[PDB]
Amino acid sequence: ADKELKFLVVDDFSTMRRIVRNLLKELGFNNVEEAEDGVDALNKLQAGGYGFVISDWNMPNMDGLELLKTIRADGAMSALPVLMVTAEAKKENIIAAAQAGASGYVVKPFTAATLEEKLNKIFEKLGM
């Protein structure tokens, strides 16, 4: 994929956001921004230019599933790739993510190699 692809990392925990930003750096993607919850993320996504969203599940104000569903129901950004991050491989969340249109999911904590495999599958599916 284009190494200048613009990523939005959404998570209410600063450490976790920084960890994801740094793993993406390890994989060669340095054009990354951060958001603290679904509200902040939607506001930033309106600014435009984003090409990929990695969003945590549990956040205050607006959680990850709600953000995903809101993205999917929008006009302009409806097809944006969205990788959901979850704390456990819980069946109802994995099913809910899939049925809501997530591009994939990944369980934290995850490594650079796991992140890379997840991103490649998505790139493959969307032809990136």
Partner: protein, 68 residues
């Protein structure tokens, strides 16, 4: 009692898909071929949900469900 069969799987996908299915339900009589995976599903999840989750990795035409 229903059977699931996954075909034309790539390197590492037999194990990966076994693990993905295992988060969703409890498989029995699991057969891991070199590029295929079959198993018996307890029937505790709709097949449309299994499909949607598995499609994160493969294509829908690679999945078949049948009565054993």
């Amino acid at each position: 009692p229903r059977r699931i069969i996954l075909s034309r799987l790539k390197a590492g996908e037999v194990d990966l898909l076994e693990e993905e299915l295992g988060h969703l339900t409890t498989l029995t009589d699991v057969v891991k071929g070199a590029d295929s995976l079959s198993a018996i599903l307890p029937g505790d999840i709709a097949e449309d949900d299994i499909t949607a989750v598995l499609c994160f990795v493969i294509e829908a035409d690679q999945i078949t469900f049948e009565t054993v």
